[PDB]
């Protein structure tokens with residue numbers, strides 16, 4: 108339902124075939140389904156709607172917390188402990204958000220693999236490439252930091268990678 | 283050594299006149315409370331050594347123990363604070379009077395300093 112957002116967790120249009128029986132023998136599945144819904148689903152729906160109308164009598168809201176965009180570790184003097192603290196907390200929050208982004212893409216991939224049945228190898232190419240890109244980015248940013256990671260170590264890793272990339276680019280430009 | 287000889291110092295004063303320009307320690311200072319606790323412990327040990335009821339034997343002498351420890355501790359804390367204030371005063375004055383030995387270096391940001399990265403793997 109609308110409990111979540113369909114654009115971040117997309118699903119195919121859900122095509123299902125119609126029953127086209129070749130025999131007039133009674134179908135046990137349909138009769139069992141009628142017994143099940145009549146004897147299980149109806150009481151569950153009445154209980155749920157009672158609970159929902161009880162909830163409607165007393166309704167309150169909780170709000171998602173918003174955070175500002177404080178200066179990052181690159182805009183901090185070498186020993187400014189307060190700017191360092193702000194930047195470190197912001198970096199850690201961004202690290203958590205990136206972790207959850209990777210989690211979302213992994214959930215997408217798992218759902219694709221389960222849904223596609225026997226055609227998952229071809230029908231889940233877009234999800235696989237999305238996970239490849241996200242995991243490649245996540246790996247560049249945080250892999251090998253180790254225990255005791257910090258914004259400074261991530262910055263040093265990024266600077267080393269940028270130096271290597273610049274050296275490679277200028278060497279290739281000398282041909 | 284370092285503080286033994288200083289200009290304008292009275293030999294056996296224990297509390298120079300310039301120490302009165304400092305805030306006195308509060309009577310509820312935790313160090314004073316610890317001194318009172320030391321006095322109470324001394325009174326209890328006095329009771330136990332002399333084979334007397336430890337908690338209740340002598341209340342007047344236990345009170346004297348506690349107040350004596352608090353009384354000495356107050357002046358001890360005053361002198362402690364005065365000597366630390368002298369240390370900071372002298373250090374700041376020496377820094378101010380010798381600028382070339384304590385120069386303010388250029389402020390660099392972490393975007394400019396190149397720190398080597400050591401991977402963990």
Ligand SMILES: CCCCCCCCCCCCCCCCCC(=O)OC[C@H](COP(=O)([O-])OCC(O)COP(=O)([O-])OC[C@@H](COC(=O)CCCCCCCCCCCCCCCCC)OC(=O)CCCCCCCCCCCCCCCCC)OC(=O)CCCCCCCCCCCCCCCCC
Pocket residue numbers: 323326327330334335336337
């Ligand atoms: C860090 C946080 C705080 C911790 C600080 C440190 C600990 C506390 C302070 C220590 C000093 C204080 C007391 C020292 C003198 C006491 C000596 C003693 O024997 O006591 C007996 C006495 C009982 O004896 P009694 O009632 O007269 O009659 C029975 C006979 O006397 C019975 O006599 P007896 O002849 O039969 O006794 C024989 C016995 C007697 O031998 C002993 O009792 C041992 C004596 C203790 C040695 C103390 C040395 C100096 C303190 C150093 C502490 C080191 C701490 C660091 C960690 C390392 C641990 C060693 O010897 C043995 O049987 C051999 C046993 C061998 C065991 C070896 C281990 C002993 C050393 C361990 C010391 C650790 C601290 C103990 C503290 C309390 C001990 C009583 O104990 C007490 O009643 C006093 C306890 C404290 C009273 C406080 C109550 C005040 C009011 C309560 C309310 C609080 C506020 C209210 C306001 C709230 C609003 C409502």
Ligand SMILES: CCCCCCCCCCCCCCCCC[C@@H](O)O[C@H](CO[C@H](O)CCCCCCCCCCCCCCC)COP(=O)(O)OCC[N+](C)(C)C
Pocket residue numbers: 286292293294295296358
């Ligand atoms: C377990 C702790 C042991 C403590 C030992 C006994 C505790 C009580 C000490 C007795 C207090 C009276 C002593 C002096 C009072 C008045 C005399 C006054 O003139 O003394 C002046 C100043 O008083 C004394 O110098 C300082 C005595 C303070 C003793 C307490 C410090 C204990 C060390 C830290 C442990 C924590 C103890 C906590 C309380 C139990 C001397 O100035 P000065 O002529 O220039 O010094 C010459 C020698 N110098 C320069 C080399 C130092």
